[model samples]
Target: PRYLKGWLEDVVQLSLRRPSVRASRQRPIISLNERILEFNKRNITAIIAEYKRKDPSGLDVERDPIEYAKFMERYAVGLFISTEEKYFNGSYETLRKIASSVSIPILMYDFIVKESQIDDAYNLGADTVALIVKILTERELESLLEYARSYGMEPLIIINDENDLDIALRIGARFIGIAARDWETGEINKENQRKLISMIPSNVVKVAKEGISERNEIEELRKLGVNAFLIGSSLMRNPEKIKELI
Candidate 1:
């Protein structure tokens, strides 16, 4: 008697029976969108533009959504639209329209775990994409970055510690966001931030995120060799203050 075929063969036969399986995987026809390419060439400092929720738990005094668009236009800072919601909020599209109206670069800040999200970012007019190392494995991270680069979108991986940095480098990420606050607990981890920043490769553009508001702290972090600062709460509280701080 003939033995049953292996599981792989069985699955292949099942797949062959389905017409949908014969259809090619929907890979988006990739293009080096000139608009995004032009935006990246500017080489300005990175800014993660977050939104303020009506709830106190989600509050960041620096993220008034109404003011964010105009504020970003006035300052010409690189804007990354952050969605507090798990899915893409209207904020990303709104920022896209604003960026189109003006000449600012925008990044889509989301918990990007699927490749489809990269396509979403591009359609929403993002020049860059943020990858959080804590949520992705080495293999998954590398695959995402490679796919993103194909679309002329740069990757900025947010790293909370030395291990995250090592993983980021292993995936060939050139831009990294260092958070001073523990995202899960909302606790400030200044020592951890300083240590991680110290270990960052000189070639990678370093951005300091979280728990930064006062000018003195910004000055101190600048001294630590960080070229760019992602200020949200501080600026949201008073947009004019950014001009004063700068």
Candidate 2:
């Protein structure tokens, strides 16, 4: 960022305004992050473009933060950058590069199961962190969830079914993500995201990840009450069509 803590401060401000964004008669809203809220308002589903390190076909992959930065400028409301070093081949260098190149809020999509990861995400300049529900115990999730709030970074609880969805609600989560990919296998599903979409409460921010690329698929997901999508493979392979999908 151009100034110290400026980017960090902006991230917290953005999340704070999204829920209480609308005007009211009883109180005065400071509305400093007004425009960001306008974009995240309910019913406005957004595309969360990802800076994919590689596609499934390992050897053939295109990794460029600038290309991703440009994409977010027009279509996406947020950016998801993987930091998992294994399957995703992600790194903090990639995260910093993309973040430095854009002002859009960045969500760190990793298999974060501990407080150490959360700290690393914050120190690495992430505005949000992805916490998978499949691996962590109930106590661990609660602790990690609280840790995320301590820094004011949104903790996007990733869920695959009703059981995981209940954990998020039990923890009083405000942001939840539903992945179309298989939880145990991590294989991207062929169908559009829907099951968990219908189960999620309207008071929170719901995000859909993987198994979606085409404009037609997006229409179908929206029909099922999914306004947001987190796409990777299709966009990385076909950057030209990103605008049309958005």
Candidate 3:
């Protein structure tokens, strides 16, 4: 069955009206499995370092933008850029510059509801794209995954709880983001995360994200079979320490 027309219309508008949006080609520069293998080969500490340099504490940011790229490449980090409405105030060109410089895979992390956003990610040189399973129906999820695959972009389904993990697998996701924080309330949901990870397939590489800072948490997650850890706010709060930790 076809998805609702309103949904398709929103996607079209975002793709056509956005200045940064671009058409995608089907050439496969790298397979999803190869990318996952590359990510795992570097000891599987693939950090999706967030680009937001400021904090509520108002401390001066340590790592420069290019320096962040160097850190990602050096550490085999899968850098992620947030495209939330609050974060999208900056120009797309800035994102393009960072994407071009980074050697490792990049993920455009956002509440991706519109198809246009997918094109924008591609135009900005994203190697992978993220989708939240909680936001779409099973049919819609399948359609979106097919659309993303058609563009040669890996679809990384973000699972906040156990239910989302099942949805991600059913939709044929190879890369999955396990966020420990709830998006709506900003509440931490660690226990649910613990439950979810235990049931996830061993073949699918799982990425642990949200509120992951301490080496202890990383060590514990590693023991749980998580392939990578996405550290952002914690690293931003203490860039030098994070640099040392890596």
lDDT of the candidates, in the order given: 0.62, 0.66, 0.66
Give the CA lDDT, 0 to 100, for residue 44 in model 3.
54
Backbone clashes in candidate 3 total: 1
**Two-way TM-score contest, 1 vs 2, winner:** 2
| Model 3 lDDT, residue 142, Cα | 82
Kindly report which residue stretches of model 2 are placed more than 4 angstroms away from their true locations once superposed: 1-37, 40-45, 55-60, 186-193
Write the residue-wise lDDT of candidate 2 on 95-155 in tens digits. Answer: 7666666667778776665566676666666677887676667787888889987877668
Off by over 4 Å in 3: 1-20, 23-36, 39-44, 53-64, 87-91
Single out the weakest 10-residue window by summed lDDT for candidate 2: 23-32
Tens-digit lDDT track of model 1 for 179-204? 88876556788899989999888777
Q: Against the true structure, what is each candidate's TM-score?
A: 0.74, 0.77, 0.79
What value of lDDT does candidate 1 attain over all alpha carbons? 0.62
- Give the Å error, residue 76, model 3: 4.1
Per-residue lDDT value at 214 in model 2: 78
**lDDT at position 91, candidate 1:** 49
User: Could you say which candidate leads in TM-score?
Assistant: 3
lDDT of 3 by residue, 2-83 (tens): 2335433344335435444564433323343355567668665555666655432232444566676666566545676654
The 10-residue segment with the lowest total lDDT in model 1: 18-27
lDDT of 2 at 4: 18
